[PDB]
Structure formats: C-alpha cells, structure tokens
Amino acid sequence: QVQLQESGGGLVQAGGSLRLSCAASGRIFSTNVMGWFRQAPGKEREFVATVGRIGGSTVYADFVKGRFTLSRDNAKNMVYLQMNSLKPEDTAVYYCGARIGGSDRLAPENYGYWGQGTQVTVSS
Amino acid sequence: VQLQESGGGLVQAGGSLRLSCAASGRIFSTNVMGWFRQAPGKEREFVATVGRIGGSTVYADFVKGRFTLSRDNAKNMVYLQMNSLKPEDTAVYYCGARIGGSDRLAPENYGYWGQGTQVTVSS
Amino acid sequence: VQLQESGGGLVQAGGSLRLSCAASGRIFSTNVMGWFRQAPGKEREFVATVGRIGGSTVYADFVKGRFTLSRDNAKNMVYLQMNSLKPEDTAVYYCGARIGGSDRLAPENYGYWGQGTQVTVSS
Amino acid sequence: VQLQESGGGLVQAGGSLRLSCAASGRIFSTNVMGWFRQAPGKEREFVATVGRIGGSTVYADFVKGRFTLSRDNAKNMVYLQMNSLKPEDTAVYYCGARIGGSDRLAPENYGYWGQGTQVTVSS
Amino acid sequence: QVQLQESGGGLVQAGGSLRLSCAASGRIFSTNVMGWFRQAPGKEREFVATVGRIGGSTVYADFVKGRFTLSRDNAKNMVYLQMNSLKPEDTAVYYCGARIGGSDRLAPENYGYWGQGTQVTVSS
Amino acid sequence: VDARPVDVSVSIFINKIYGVNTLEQTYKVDGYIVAQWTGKPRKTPGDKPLIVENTQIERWINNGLWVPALEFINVVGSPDTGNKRLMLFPDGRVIYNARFLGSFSNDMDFRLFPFDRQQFVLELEPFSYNNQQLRFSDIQVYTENIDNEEIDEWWIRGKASTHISDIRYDHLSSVQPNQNEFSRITVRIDAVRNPSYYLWSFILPLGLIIAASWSVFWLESFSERLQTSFTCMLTVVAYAFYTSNILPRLPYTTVIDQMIIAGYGSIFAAILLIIFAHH
Amino acid sequence: VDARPVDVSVSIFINKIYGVNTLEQTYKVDGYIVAQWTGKPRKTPGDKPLIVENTQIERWINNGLWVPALEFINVVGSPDTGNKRLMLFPDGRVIYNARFLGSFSNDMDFRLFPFDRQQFVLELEPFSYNNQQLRFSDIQVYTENIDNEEIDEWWIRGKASTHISDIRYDHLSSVQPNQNEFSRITVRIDAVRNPSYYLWSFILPLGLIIAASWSVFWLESFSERLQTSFTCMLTVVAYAFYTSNILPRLPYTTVIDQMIIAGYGSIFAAILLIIFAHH
Amino acid sequence: RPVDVSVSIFINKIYGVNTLEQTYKVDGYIVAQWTGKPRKTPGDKPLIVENTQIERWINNGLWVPALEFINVVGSPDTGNKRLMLFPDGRVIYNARFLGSFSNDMDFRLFPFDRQQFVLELEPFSYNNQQLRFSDIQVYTENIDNEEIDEWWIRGKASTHISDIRYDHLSSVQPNQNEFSRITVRIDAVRNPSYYLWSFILPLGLIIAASWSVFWLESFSERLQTSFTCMLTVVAYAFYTSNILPRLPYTTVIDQMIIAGYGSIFAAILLIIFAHH
Amino acid sequence: ARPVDVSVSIFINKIYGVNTLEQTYKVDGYIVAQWTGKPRKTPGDKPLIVENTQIERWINNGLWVPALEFINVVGSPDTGNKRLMLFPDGRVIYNARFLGSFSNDMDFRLFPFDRQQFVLELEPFSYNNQQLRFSDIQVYTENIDNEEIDEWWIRGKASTHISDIRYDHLSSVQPNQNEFSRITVRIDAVRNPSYYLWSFILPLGLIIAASWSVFWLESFSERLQTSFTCMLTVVAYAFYTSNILPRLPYTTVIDQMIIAGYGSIFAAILLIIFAHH
Amino acid sequence: DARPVDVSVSIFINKIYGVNTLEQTYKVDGYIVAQWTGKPRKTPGDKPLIVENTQIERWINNGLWVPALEFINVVGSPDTGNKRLMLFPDGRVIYNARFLGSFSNDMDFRLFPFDRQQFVLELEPFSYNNQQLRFSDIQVYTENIDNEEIDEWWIRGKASTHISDIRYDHLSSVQPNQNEFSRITVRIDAVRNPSYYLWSFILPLGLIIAASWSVFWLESFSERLQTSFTCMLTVVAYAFYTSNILPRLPYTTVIDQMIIAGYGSIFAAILLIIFAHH
C-alpha cells in the first residue's frame, strides 16, 4: 500500500533541538494513523508520540515530559516531531509507523509500513 | 341503544330537581353515560360523568358542588340530583353515551343522545 | 387424590384439639394442603396453609396465635394444633388441596376436599 | 416555488425599512421561510426565521432586538421590520425556503432563493 | 481424559510441615481446574483448596486457617499444597481432583479424574 | 387572613409526541410545564424578580416556600423532570417552570389501523390540595411549528383542546364537607396516522395477490389449478408473517388483519370451487 | 401495661394492570396506596390538618414522626413511587398517600391460552413491625371504570377480592416469643383474556389449512399427491414460524401449539396413507 | 452588564440512531467559562471543586447557571463534573455527558441518506440581558478508518450563536424575552457497503432472473415459474423488513421491492396477453 | 480483639430471567445479617427499629454497619426496604430486600436437557476474617405447589459453604490480613423440556423421518426435486428454531439435530445420484 | 518544585461481555484500586481506618482529598457498587470500588466469526494534570478460566498496560505546562469462539452450494431451470435465516460474502443452462 520516509535526525549537544519529519505516500486517507517510535541499540522499539482520539489531544510517552511536540500539515501528507531540551537518553533511531489497525495507539504491533528510520544522537 | 331523559321542569332559584336517564339497548355499564346541557343560542356543554378510577365523578366547573351523579346499574339508569339552582342552569339537559374517543368531557365522543329534558329556573 | 380429616370432637372453652389430614394419590408435597372451616349457615372460611417462602405459614385473622400448622412430608400428613378454643371455633374443619389458582386464602382455588371433622367448643 | 423580496433601499443610520417576501408555488406554510444577508466579498449569513416551538423566532446575534419577523399566512408572505439600522447592516437581503433540512440557520438547507433586495445604510 | 498423581504425603509430628504435589497428564488446558480434597476414615470427602475466580485469589476451606498454601507450575502442569502447623485433625488421604463441570469449585461432585491419593498422618 | 383558594395559571409546551406503544396504550410526551400563582409579597435582591433553580428550589421549600406538587394523572411512572426554575417576584407572584419527558396512557383504539385517529391527552391535578385551597384558573397550550409532516409518523389535526373540571372523590367524603373536590386540567392533541408505508407495502401488494388468486381458474388442467392454489395459500401465510413481523401488537384485528383473513377466505372459496368441477 | 398495636386502614386504587410477561410470570400495576392510623397528637398551624409532600416527609421522619414502611411482598424490584403526601391531624391522625408503578409476580398458568383466566394479586405487609406493634384493621379496593373492554387485552371479572391474614415466620420465632407474626393485606383482581385476535388470526386460518390438507387425496397420480403433501408440510412450518413470532414465550404448550402439532400430525398421517396405497 | 459565557463542546461519539424516534446518542464534554464575582481561594491559587463539593458552593452563594440542551430527550447522563474557581472571579465549569438528542431526520434516501447531528444549548432561566454566549468551539473525534464505522463524518463542525425571542413571556417583562442559543452541527453520510452487497446486488440478480421465465417453451411452465419468483420477492421482502429500520415511509430499497413486484405483475400480464 | 461473628440468612423468592449469552440470572429475595456490636442506649431500653433513610443517620452518628458485597452480582442490586434492629446489649439485625442480576458459569450444550447451579456469593467488602467472619448461613427457598407451570425445576435443598479467600494483591500491604470470609449458596435446577420436546424434537423427527420417503418415488426427476423441497424445509425449520432458541456461542442438542437434518438430505441426495449417473 | 502525587493503580477484570457490534461497545465488570500517600493522621488505635460508601462523602466535605479518576472510554456513568477508603496513620490512602460500565473502542468485525478484538480501559484524572497527579504504575488482574469452550470470547495472552501523557490543545491558552494529563491504558486481547457459526452457518451453506451444481445432472431443460429457481429461493431463505441471527453491521462479513457467492453460483449455473438450450 503506502510508503513512509523519516528525516531531520542527526548529532546534537545535550539541551539542543531537532525537528523530525515523516513523509507518507500512498493510499493513506489521514495523517492520524502515523505515530513516532524509537529504538536504542540493545533495547525494544518504544512508543514516542501519536494523535489522541479526541480533537486537540496528542498521546506522548512518559519520558517526553513536555519537551517534544507532534505536528501534521494534513495537505502535503506529513507529520513532524519537534524535539527540544534533548537528553543523552533520547539517543535512538526514530521510526515513523502507520497504524495498520487494532485498537491501541501505543502498541507497536498495531502498526506497519515503517520507514528506514532517522538516527538522533545526543552527546556530552 | 336508545336514551331517554326525564325529571325536568320549572323550579325557583335555590330549588332542586332530580334528572333521570333510562338506557335501552346494547349497553354493558352505566359508566359510558354522561350528562350535558344546551341553553338557547349556546354550545352543548358537559355537566357530569363517571371518573376513570372508582369513587370518582367528573363535574363541569359551573357545578360547584351543587349537582350529584348517581347510578342504578341494575335498572340501566343514571340520575342527576341538582340542588341550589341558579337562573344560569336554565337549559335542555341531554344524556349521551360515550361512543368512544378518549376525552369524557368532549361532546363529540358522545352519541345515542336522548330527546332532552327542559330545566327552567326562575326569579 | 383423596383427603381425610380426623382429630375433631367435643372440647370445653380454653381447651385443645389436634386435627390431622391424610392424603392418598397424586400428591408430591404437603404444601398444597390447607385447612378451612364451615359453621352451619355460614361460608367456608380459610383457617391455615403454608406460606410461599420456607419458614412461613399463613393464618386467618381469627387464629390470633392459638392454632399451629405442622407437617410430616414422609407420612403425607398435615396437622392443625388448636389451643385456647372459643365457642366461635365450632365448625366442620375441612382439608383441601390447592387445585390451582394463585391465592392460598381462596377456597375456589382448593379441591379434593375431605368429608370434614366436626369441632364442638362448649360453655 | 418562486420567492420575491422587496422593501429595500437607501436609508440613513438609525433609520427603518420593512422588507417583504412574496411566496408562490408549492408552499402550505410561511414557517419554512427565512431571511439571509450577503455583503460584497462576504458569505451569506442567517438573519431571521421561525422558531421550532409556538411563539418563538430565531434571530442572528447582530439583530440585537432591532429586527422583527412577521408573517401573513393568507398572502403567503413574510416581513422583516428593520429598525435602528447601522452601516454594518448594508447587504443584499435574501429570502429562502427551507427545502426540509434539520438546521434553520444553515443557508445550505434552503432553496428557492429570491433575487435579493439591496439595503444601503449611509452616514 | 486426564490422569492425576499425588505425592508428598507421610508421617509428621504435630506442628510439622508437608508439601503435597499433584502432577496432571492428558487433555488438561490449565491447572486452575485442579483442587485439593481430603478424606479421613469413615468421613466424607471434604474440600481443602483451589484457585479463586479473580487473579491473585485462592479458595480455602474454613479449617485451613492460613496454615496451607496452594501454588502452581502451569509449565510443568503441577499444583502444590504447602501444609504448615499440622494438627492431628489433618490426618487423612489427600486427593487431587479436576473440575469436570458445574459452577461450584467447593463441591466434590463437580470434580473428576481423582488420583489414588496421598496419605498424611499427623501424630499428637 | 386570605382563606380563598389559590388561582394557578398553567401553560404546557408540547415539543414532541412519539414512541406510541399500541399494546400498552401509552405514548411519550416531551415538553415544558409553566405554573403561576400569587403568594405573599417579598423582598428580593434589588427588588427585581429572583431566579431559584433546581436544588435551591428545595432549600426555599424547607425554609417555608409553598410549591404545590401537581400530578400528571395519566403518567405511567415518574416523569423524567429535567431543569426546574422558580421566579419570585416582589409583588408576591410565583412562576414555576420545568422540562418534562413522560410516558402517558390513554384509551387508544387501533381497530382502523393504518387509518386510525388518536387523541393524545395530558391530565394535570394537584396531588394534595383540593379546590378550596388550589384551583386552576386557566390553561394555555403551545405546540411545535412543523415544516413537513411527510417525514413524520403522526399528523396533528387542529388546535389543542383544553378543559378545567372538578373531580369529586368518594373515598374523601369521610373527613370534612366540600373538601373532596380537586381541580383538573385536561389537554388533548388530535392526530391521524401517516398511511404511507402501509398503503404501498401492505394493502397494494396484498391487493395484487388477492387479484392474482382468482387467475388460477384460467389454467388448463385440474392438476395445474390446484397446485397453484396451494402456492397462493403459502404466499398468504408468508404475507401474514411479513405483516406480523412489522405491524404493531394488538388484542384485536386491524383493516390489514381483516384483509389477510379475506385472503385466506378467497383461496379457500376458490379451492372449494375447483373441487366442485372435477369430482 | 403494654401499648396496643397500631390499627392501620388501607385503601388501594388500581388504575392499570398491563405489561404481562408470561415467561417471568409478572404484570405491571399502576395505582395509589392510602394508609391511615392514629399517631400521637400534635400542634398544627391554625389547628387545621397539615399537608407534607414528597421531600418534606423525610424532614418530619428525621424529627421523630413515625411513618412505618409497608412492603409489597410480591413486587419485583423497587416500585417507581411518584408523588407522596402525609396529612397530619392535630388529634394524632395520619394519612399517607403515594402513587406507585411496580412489576408484580404471581402464579400464572397459560396452558389454556388464549382462553386462560388470571388472578392479579397485590400483597402488602409492614417491613419491620409485627402484629403486636402494627396490624391492618381493614382494606378497600377501588378499580378502574371501564366503558368498552373490546379494545382491552384483559377482561376484569367481578369485584376485587380482599383478605387480612397473619404470617407466622419460623425464622425469628426464636428472635422473641409471640413477636413472629405479621399483618398481611391481599388484593385479587380476576381477569379473562380477550381471545378475539387469536380466534380470527390463529385458530380460523389454521383450521382452513388443516381442512385444505385433506384435499390432496383428490389428486389423480401418486406423484401429484406426494409433492402437494410436502408443500402443505412447508405451509405448516411457515405457519408455525408465523405463530412463534407473535405467541408469548412459555416453557409448555398452549391450545394453539397443540393445533400446530395436530397440523404436523394430520400431514404425516396423510403421507403415511398415500404410501400405504402405492407400495 | 450580561455575563459572557464561552463554551467548548467535545464530541467523543455519535451512535445509536433511532430512525422511528428521530433520535441519536451523543457522548462528550461541555466546558463553560465566565468571569464572576472575585473570591478568596486556598493559597490564592485556582481551586478545583469536584462533583458533590460544587453543591456545597452553590448553597453558599456561588452562581452556576443551568444550561439546557434544547434537543435532549430526557435528562442527560452526567458523569464527572467540576468547577475551577479563580480569585479574579473567573469560573470554569466542565462536565462529561451522554444524552439522547432529537433532530429532523429524513431517511427516504436510505442507505444513501445524509444526516445533520445537532446540539442546541441555551440557559434555562437567564435571558441575554443577564447571560449571553460570547463564543463556541467544537472538537470532534480523530478517525483512523471510517470503513469500520456506520456513519461517515463530512467536514468540520458548524456552529451558530442566535437569539431566541419568545412571544409568551413578552408580557412578563419588556426586552426580557430573548435567550442566547448555541447550535452545533455534525454532517454525516451513511456507510452503504452492507446494503449495496447484501440488498441491492442480490435483488438485482433476482429482478434480472425474473425475465428469464419467457425463455420457457410452454404456458404451464411460464406461469408456474412466475408464481415461484413472486414467492421469492415476498421472501426477499420479508428478509429485508427483518433487517431494515422502522420507518413511516418508503426507502430506495422499499421502492426496489415494489419494482420487483411490478416486474413480476407486468410479466404475468404479458403471459396472459398471449394465451386467452 | 476477636473477629466479629456474622450470622447470615438468605431468602430466595424467585430465580428467573436467565440470559444464556451473558451467563446471568435474576434473583429476588431477602438478606438477613446478624452480629453483636457495642452496647447502647435505645428508647425505653427496648429493641429499636431503624428503617431505610434513618440507617444513614445512625451510621453518621457512629453505628458500625459493614458492607457485604454479592461477589457475583452484575451491577448494583436493586435494594428495596432496608432495616436495622438495634438492641441495648449490642446486638444488630440487618434485614434488606434485594433484586440482582447474578453471573455464573452456565453450560447450555445439553439444552433443553441442561442442569444449572444458581449461586450467590457473599463477602464483606472491606473487612478481612480477622475483623469480620461469617459464623453460619441459613437458606430458605420458595415452597412450590406445581413445577409443571415453571421454566426451571429445583432439585434438592440449597447447598451452602463458608470458605476463606486469600488475595495475593493484599500480601506486602499487611501480614495475615489478606483473607476474606465468604458465604456460597447454591440452588440446583433442571430445565422443563416439555415445550422443546413437543414443538422442536418431535416435528423435526417427523421431517427427518419423511425425508427418507423420497426413495419411494418412481423417477429420478421426482426424487431429486422433492429432496430440494425437503432441503428448503430444513432451512425453514432452522429459521423457525433460530427465532425462538437462545443465543449461544456453541451448538445445542436441537442445533445438532438440524445439522443431522442437513446431513440426512445431503446423504440422500448423494444416494439418488449414485443410482442414475 | 511542588512534586505531583504519585497514584498507584490496580484493575481487576471480572467479566468482559455484552459486545454490541453496531455501537462498538462492550461491558466490563471489575474493581479499581488506587493508592497514594497523603498527610499522616491519627487513626483509632493507630491501626488503618476503613471508611466506606456514603461516609467517604462526609470525609471529603471535611477536607479529605479523593481525586476523581475518569474512565475515558466509558459510555455513560459506570454503575459503581461498594467503595471504601483505607486511611493509614503513615499518611497512605487506598481507594477501592466495584464497577460495571459500557466501554467503547474501535472494533472491526469484517473477519467475523474469525475476528480478534482488543478490549481496552482508559483511566485518567478528571481535573488534575500530571504536575498535580501522575500515575506511577498499573497492575492488571484478570479472571482464571477453567474451560473456554462454554465462553463466547477466548482471551489470548496477558493484559497489556501503558502509562502515557495526554497534551490538550484547548488547555495551552489556559496555563503554561499545565495542559498534560496522566493516562493508564489496559488492553485484553481476545479471539471469537467460531464453533456455532462453523457448524450452523458455513457447513450447511457449503452443503447447499455443493448441491446447487447437482442440477446439471437433470435430463431436460424444464427440470434444470425450475430446480435452479428452487435453489435461488433456498439461498434467499438461508440469507433470511442468517440475518435473523448475525449481528448488525455496516459492512459484510465472511458469512455475508458466502451468501453472495451462493447467489453468484446460482446466477452462473442459470447462465450455463441457458447457454445450452437456445
């Protein structure tokens, strides 16, 4: 069906910022199904951010602590993750997955069409 | 079913009269009966009928405790005891059987009307 | 099914009697059984029967704690222990089986009546 | 179903105008009728229509007691009495008939629109 | 079509402990179905212990009084009955039965595939 | 003191009449009840009318304010009362207003279904105060402004009919003279059923079947005439189910039910006619 | 010296008996309950009877007024209580009046349906007070005045039957000696079902089908006789499915159910007769 | 002088449409905000007052006006509710609700019918000289896939602020008969996938197969097969009725069944117009 | 201090409204709870009857009335009249009317010949067995005249149990305070199969019996066309059955008989073909 | 500064039943346990204090902090049974309550009767943001099943849990960094028991679609056609049978597709019969 492509990652100092972008191309009907995930070497793929069920709401992982923000720009079919006050713990490969179905926005198994990933490295 | 009123006549103000209605025909209860009145150049207005629940009787707002509806289910009869009569009560009193509908106060819901009994209260 | 009463007789006022009812035939429970009484020229009135829930017994308003209904489901029998007998209790005591209906107190809902046991309270 | 507005014109601020809408065709009630307005380079906004319950009329938030909707069900006509007119009220006033629908205030639920009547409020 | 096998019984002094074990083999889905019962000479088979309906709960007979504990090993298809503070009143043949039906985990009628039993003897 | 009865003025706003239950002879009414009387004059904040809402209504009653309970005589169970308000005027006036939704019972004759007419009534009476204490002075009824009735199940015919009568209770005459009479408001809404889904989907296809039932006699052999009459019999049974599956539950027969019996009769007559030719 | 039991006089007004649920053996009753007793004398404003309605009744109970709870023994769940009122007399007299709607249970045998007779009962008993504390002195029942029963599901036969008995409980016989008996009011309404709908729509068409089922023997060949008998079999199944969709849910068979089995029996007998001629 | 109330409505779910009653269920949150009389709050910070605690503040003099859902059918099921009281006088009332709402619903184009789900909010006692709605914001559910849904929401929520003039209570006081009303509308299309594949398609295959009777050799064959198709259309009509919603009029599907009856009755008249 | 011994009596007026798919049933009855509280002063130093809303006034004033929860109740039970009987010597007798929907494991695979165990489980909501224990349980059930008119047939007397429930989530919260006293009441009943025998098994039997009579037809054209008519009848009977029979996630005796009816026709059809071609 | 209150939650799931396919709801019966540490207090005998039902309200009026925890995906007010408070002298507060509620979630029944569902519970404080109240942990206890054969749903695996933060855009304008809420998510995975639909729907429909092709073995055209219309009537009668049982849905299931296949097979067989005679 659809194809996902992440960008915006890189090397940043602690306290710094980055803006990740995900481009969706295919039979995608909404930017709502898209969700951000992360995977540090030797660690499981964990949830980062996705849309909430009701309008005005966004679901963030407990580690985000107000630092990251999920955006959309519906038209050009793209989502964005504005990452601020970056800590070395945030070092991982950030993935953009499209919710295939199920009924759990947080579970990585209900996702699919995952991109190649964008590496974010937070240093000294 | 044919209805027949009686008991009407000339009475002085403050006086009394006992109207009677005889039901002859396809009738299983005197509950369906109801008293109405019609003064010259005026609409046929409700006077008295049985209430939905046992022990209750529905009276028009002008009755003001003065009239009483009684029944003799064995003789297929209803009676209207009228007391403290005022000249305003002068009319032809009709006895109708509730044909149907779902408003005991509505003349349209009554038929098999009798010929009527003239009540004349003087001064 | 057949019902048979016994235990009646002549007793002085304040005295006691123990009535017994034996059932024989299409009967799976003594619960369906009920005691009734009939004084000459008077209606057959309810005396006692089992209540709907376990531990309960229904008594007529005249019993006033004096009579007690007991049962022996093994011997297919019900007993009416009558104490503090008044001359008003003089009647023929009947044992009937609740033939159906849905009223423990109505004799109409009872059938297969026994011959009766005469109870005579003197003064 | 043809609609025709009239009563528009040039008025000074604080002035009055009485708009009229003549309905002709498949209309049995003036209730489906509503007034709307459209200023150049602006969307068609609701002005006034009949309310759901008897005695009620729906008015836009800008009306602020100044305009009144009346009807003549005999002549299939609705009137909009506009008082204390401000230059902000300058627009082409339209009369539409609710083609059924389930939102009195939405222009989309209206058809059979008239040509419009221009009201110009000066200073 | 299951086979049940008790073990761990024996002779113990009053105040002593024993650990009974029941091994299930066959068309058994869960160890939750398994329950411990006891039968003293010339006395009826009485309920001892079984799993409760809600997670974390275990049903114990009124004589247990905190002294016995039911444990399970769903992987090995094993249930264990740790018996502590044993009184001579506990002397009986302990049986392990499986809930064949009904809707009362306390009734032995609702149990089948009973084992041969394990004799526990408590000396005063 | 003033010992005269309190004149209560009532207004009823009928928003909706729906959810008719044919077997229970009930219908649902959504609306507003407005009750007004003149009590003892009072001092209100700034000598302007005072709005008292919902739970505060209770606090005023506990403190001595007289708010009589008016009962819907023909209500089936406690009506779902929404918001309620009181307006306390300094001149003594009291205005009670409340939203209500209730199941109301009345005598409903559905024998002429789908061409049946109904009178939806609301009966109002004080629960405790006789007409020597509380009497209804007037009743005003306001009903909904409809755009198109085509989309509606019921078609309201005419204006609302109202009555103010006195109910004399015989179980009450065992206390004090002239204290057994109660003031009663009667409100009546006349409506005719929409026969759309019933003319096109029940009378018309049933008519086409009863018409086609007589066209079995034009078949050549007795074997053909009979086997087709049993097929029509099966169709009238299949149609009798179709009606039962949709039509309302009643303890009597409707126009449609009579047509089904006519359909059974027509086939049984036609069958007797086919036999009265062969053997 | 022991205080005498409180004599309570009860009046029951039955507005409606409806919503019979055959399988649950329940029926809905809408009415009014009136209870009267002489309490302790009190001061009332102007020495006139005082009216206390709904939420104000509680305020009097908290303050020490004795209002015993009377339970409907055969009610299924809490009855929907509408308005309630206390009439307090200075001489001690108390009159309690409340509107109710409840689901009542009783033994209901529907084996003779649609020609079944029912006894609708109401059982009233104090919840906590024995007959040494509270006894029912009398009971009066007032029922609805019916104009035409043709439009009604049930036909009331005779007047309401009443009883006042004493219920002795064996549990709580030990609680105290002579304190285990409770006063009980029983009210009974006898009714016969209106069988008009089932006569014309179920018995009559089924009769015309069972009558037409024997007409298959008038067919010339064995091939014709048999194929038509299977068509009639399909019709009886279609009629059985038509009845099931209307008829009430029961754990036994009714007169109508027996007629359907008779219809199956008649066809199976006719089929055995056709086979007992050819082979 | 009138109090400006700012409202926010959150629509979590629109479901349970009752075609005959012309009602639908709505689950959501209502947020009402106004500036009232300044107060003293613990630690001079905003104060959260939940559920049963609010009733205590109201008895003690706090003004919380009753806002009524005009088109609600019976009292809505109010879940959790709370106040947020600021020392500057600002008041925020928020509550969870579930109610049955009525509106004019035309199902004549079923299963291709479009609906407008509305919510009307108005103060129960306060006219717009006392209480007026200053604004309305609506937030609706973010849908992943509508394929699995009965209704298909079309566009953003439409909102209105109007004044309702009552002719009754015009005499109660002058210029005191107008009330502030909020109107929120949700447009939706029915998902016709079940009715396309299970009703229109098989009925089409039956109406198409109904004309195949003419291919028969004899009159005895042509007629007996036409009654079989008649029985099938009745069979399909009783299949349809058992699923289809209860309505006082005919739908597209109902018209197709009448067309099916018409096609057979026409074919029957054609066969008779050949023999005799 | 010793746990409070609570004596319980349950009165079962009615067991009805079985919901096969939800595995629930409705129970109407009374609950009597008796324990000895603290000695108190009552008017005239005689037992005191406290009813419904007055109970709440006594609790606010310090009276201990523990909440006893029906473990297998589905939603809050409809509690009718409630009463407390207070004695100066500390004794308390709580009596209340209840109507509740109770859940239980119900296996309807043998329907209409299925047997059920209707259970009621009672447990204190907050007080463990060191604080509150059930000393005994008595059950009183309805005296039945004729079970012919009843859907269910009660078999034997009520079975009762008093057990202790140990909760693991309560360990590491407090030691030896994780056990709760539980009353279990069980009513055994057998379904009345009279309606299903005469209206489902018997007519279906007459149909499956008549299905084999097709072989007595002369030609292949007659044998086949009649087998499709019987197929339509079994579908007709399956849709008649479905409209009455309870909703279940498995097959009943009646459902198996319908599959047997489909199997018998498909077998008969394979037999007809295995003669002609 | 001013650390939020850590709330520890335990959810007991007693029953998942009453699935409503068209409303996309399901009924859950269980218990909710929430614990947090408050200010230390004097309790009778310095042992924990049990306050239950209507007495909780008396403690709240008197100043006790009991936050309202909302079930986000509940449909209407959940039926709350008994509820208690265990107040410890050490300051701890434990709130336990029995509940029954109708919960909504995205439910796809297109693969019915072979459909899999995820039954979720979402809990969130009604008024307190994560700067005031945060969920520290969630524990889920589910029912111990003996035999799933008698059950409609078959639970697969352990309960899945999550603790996230919900940022609300309508609250950004209200106060800085006060627009985030703590949320517990609980998920139960289940597979439908297809036994009834396999034996009563797929199998008999299969025997009908198999018997539908047997018409080609009839000798004449008059026999082949009249029997094809009889099979057509059977597929309609079977479609009416399935509809009366199958759940209400806005789409087609595996069973619905099989009925369309049954209609297609007959229409194909009818076209084949005509393509032989004329």
CA gap G229, I214 in Å, rounded: 12
The type of residue at D35 is: W
Domain ranges of chain G: 1-194, 195-279
Residue H111 DSSP label: T
Q: Provide the 8-state DSSP code for F261.
A: H
Chain E residues whose C-beta is within 8 A of a chain I C-beta are 47, 52, 56-62, 64-66, 101-104, 106-107
Query: How distant is the alpha carbon of residue D79 from its chain centre?
Result: 8
Cβ atoms of H36 and H63 closer than 8 Å: yes
Burial status of residue D3 (CB atoms within 10 A of its CB: 0-12, 13-18, 19 or more)? buried
**CB distance G27 to G103 below 8 Å:** yes
Per-residue tokens: E65: 């009084």
| DSSP-assigned states of every residue in H245-274 | PP-SS--HHHHHHHHHHHHHHHHHHHHHHH
Structure tokens at F172: 């009450």
Q: Supply the Cα-derived Rg of chain G in whole angstroms.
A: 29
* Region of residue G64 (phi > 0: left; psi between -120 and 50: alpha; otherwise: beta): left
Cβ of G167 within 8 Å of Cβ of C58? The answer is: yes
Spell out which residues of chain E touch residue I119, defining contact as CB-CB under 8 Å.
Answer: 103-104
Q: Which residue of I has its CA nearest to C98?
A: I145
**J179, I276 contact by CB (below 8 A):** no
Strands (E), chain J: 5-20, 25-37, 49-52, 69-71, 79-87, 92-104, 116-125, 133-142, 153-155, 160-168, 180-192
C77-82/C17-24 β-pairing: antiparallel
Q: How far is B44 from chain G (nearest CA, A)?
A: 22
Q: Do F200 and H74 touch (CB under 8 A)?
A: no
Pairwise CB contact (< 8 Å): A102 & J118: yes
> Closest-CA residue in chain F for D104?
F147
Place of tokens 């836009």: D60
Q: Are H131 and H35 in contact, with CB atoms under 8 Å apart?
A: no
Domain span at residue E76 reads 1-124
CB-based burial label for C87 (10 Å; 0-12, 13-18, 19+): exposed
Q: Are I27 and I118 in contact (CB under 8 A)?
A: yes
Q: Which residues are CB-contacts of E76 (< 8 A; sequence separation ≥ 6)?
A: E23
Tell whether J40 lies on the interface with I, counting CB pairs under 8 A.
no
Number of independent structural domains in chain B: 1
Contacts 24+ apart (CB under 8 A), J45-49: J46/J89, J47/J89, J48/I174, J48/J86, J48/J87, J48/J88, J48/J89, J49/J85, J49/J86, J49/J87, J49/J88
Q: Which residues of J93-132 are buried (b: 16+ CB within 10 A; e: fewer)?
A: bbbbbbbbbbbbbbbbbbebbebebbbbbbbbbbbbbbbb
The helix/strand/coil state of I207 is helix
Distance CA(F111)–CA(F22), nearest Å, equals: 11
The DSSP code for F5 is P
**CB contacts, 8 Å: E56 with chain J:** 141
My answer on whether omega of the bond before H174 falls inside 30° of 0, hence cis, is: no
| Chain D residues within an 8 Å CB radius of F187 | none
CA distance J191 to chain E (A): 17
Q: What is the DSSP letter of G104?
A: E
How far is the C-alpha of I256 from the C-alpha of J267, rounded, in Å? 31
Q: Do I142 and C52 touch (CB under 8 A)?
A: yes
CB F6 within 8 A of CB F135: yes
- Give the contacts of F126 (CB within 8 A, at least 6 positions apart): F8, F68, F69, F70, F71, F133, F134, F182, F183
Q: Is the CB of residue F53 less than 8 Å from the CB of residue F83?
A: yes
Rounded Cα gap, residues I80 and I96, in angstroms: 7
**Chain I residues whose beta carbon lies within 8 Å of the beta carbon of residue E49:** none
Q: Coil, strand or helix: which one is J274? A: helix
Q: H162 to chain D: which residues are within 8 Å by CB?
A: 46, 58-61, 105
Cα angle at I263 between I262 and I268, to 5 degrees? 100
Structure tokens at I22: 């939800």
Per-residue DSSP letter, F131: T
The answer to whether chain J touches chain C by having 3 or more C-beta pairs less than 8 angstroms apart is no
Q: Closest Cα partner for J222 from J273, J272, J172?
A: J273
Separation in Å, CA C56 to CA C98, G96, J175: 17, 29, 68
Residues contacting residue J220 through CB under 8 Å, at least 6 positions apart: none
Task: Locate E55 and state its tokens.
Answer: 């997670």
Q: Which residues contact G133 (CB under 8 A, 6 or more apart)?
A: G5, G6, G126
Give the three-class secondary structure for B12: strand
Nearest to I192 by CA among G247, G23, G112, E103: G23
Residues 6+ apart with CB under 8 A from C23: C1, C2, C3, C4, C30, C33, C76, C77, C97
B and F: number of Cβ contacts within 8 A: 57
> Residue F160 in contact with residue F144, Cβ under 8 Å?
no
From the CA of I124, how many Å to the nearest CA of chain C? 26
Pairing of strands H3-18, H131-140: parallel
Spell out the residues 6+ positions from residue H207 whose beta carbon is closer than 8 angstroms to its own: H256, H259, H260, H263
Would an 8 Å CB–CB cutoff place H247 in contact with chain F?
yes
Tell me if A80 sits within 8 A of A99, measured CB to CB: no
Alpha carbons J80 and J60: distance in angstroms, whole number? 18
Q: What is the interface size between A and H, counted as CB pairs within 8 Å?
A: 31
Q: Are strands F6-21 and F134-143 parallel, antiparallel or unpaired?
A: parallel
Q: J77 CB near a chain H CB, below 8 Å?
A: yes
* Contact (CB<8Å) I159/E61: no
Omega cis (within 30) before J113 = yes
Computed on alpha carbons and rounded to an integer, the radius of gyration of chain C in Å comes to: 13
CB-count burial class (<10 Å; 0-12, 13-18, 19+) for C26:
exposed
Q: Is F266 helix (H, G, I), strand (E, B) or coil?
A: helix
Q: How many Å apart are CA E80 and CA G118, to the nearest integer?
A: 59
Query: What are the backbone angles phi and psi of residue G56, rounded to the nearest 5°?
Result: -75, -25
In units of Å, what resolution does this entry have? 2.8
Say whether the J–F interface has 3 or more Cβ pairs within 8 Å: no
Strand order in the sheet with F6-21: F50-53, F80-88, F93-105, F26-38, F6-21, F134-143
- Based on DSSP, count helices (H) and strands (E) in chain I, helices before strands: 5, 11
DSSP state of A55: T
State both tokens at I277: 């071609």
Beta strands in C25-116 (DSSP E): 33-38, 45-50, 56-60, 67-72, 77-82, 91-98, 110-111
Say what the alpha-carbon torsion angle J156, J158, J163, J169 is, to the nearest 10 degrees.
10
- Cite the DSSP H helix spans in H154-251: 193-195, 201-209, 219-241
